[PDB]
Design a protein around this ligand. Structure first.
Ligand code: HEM
Ligand SMILES: [C-]#N
Length: 153
């Protein structure tokens, strides 16, 4: 996993996300959908949004952003002891939503990009490295659960 030092950097960084969860959540989805349009086909409630302007204006899309970052924040706060919180999530994503593990890689990249754009001077190589390692741990644990459930991880 990560050292206590690395977890400290991930939590301080997350401190910046918590100051505007809706703003960061909205940007992560606009990057994700514009960057990897196939991901949009998994959200039956958003498929009709075709332009960047329509996405930016969607309060429903902003609410989804809040849901995702709220859940992820709760997990990162566990510093690796997140067996309990990941289980339900792998379960719904694999079996109900049908999200390939690769889309979790796309959304992680989107998170890194938003942090770079919104906090360019404050999100340095140390904080970025730690944030990448935490998201990698998170994805690897989900992937492990997908395999347990009989899906490709
Ligand atoms: C950091 C990664 C993510 C987190 C923490 C996360 C979390 C959430 C949670 C908390 C919900 C609501 C409860 C549930 O249904 O399980 C949810 C709903 C959903 N998630 Fe994710 N998710 C992640 C990534 C993704 C990705 C990459 C996709 C699609 C490309 C996806 C698609 C969905 C869909 C289709 C739903 C239902 C939306 C609506 O309610 O119809 N998720 N996710
Ligand atoms: C999942 N959003």
């Amino acid at each position: 996993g990560l050292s206590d030092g690395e977890w400290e950097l991930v939590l301080k960084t997350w401190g910046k996300v918590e100051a505007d969860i809706p703003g960061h959540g909205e940007t992560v989805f606009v990057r994700l959908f514009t960057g990897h349009p196939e991901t949009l086909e998994k959200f039956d409630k958003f498929k009709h949004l075709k332009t960047e302007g329509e996405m930016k204006a969607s309060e429903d899309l902003k609410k989804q952003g809040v849901t995702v970052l709220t859940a992820l924040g709760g997990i990162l706060k566990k510093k690796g002891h997140h067996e309990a919180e990941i289980q339900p999530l792998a379960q719904s994503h694999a079996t109900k939503h049908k999200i390939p593990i690769k889309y979790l890689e796309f959304i992680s990249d989107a998170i890194i990009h938003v942090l770079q754009s919104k906090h360019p001077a404050e999100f340095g190589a140390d904080a970025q490295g730690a944030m990448k390692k935490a998201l990698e741990l998170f994805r690897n644990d989900i992937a492990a659960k997908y395999k347990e459930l009989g899906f490709q991880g």
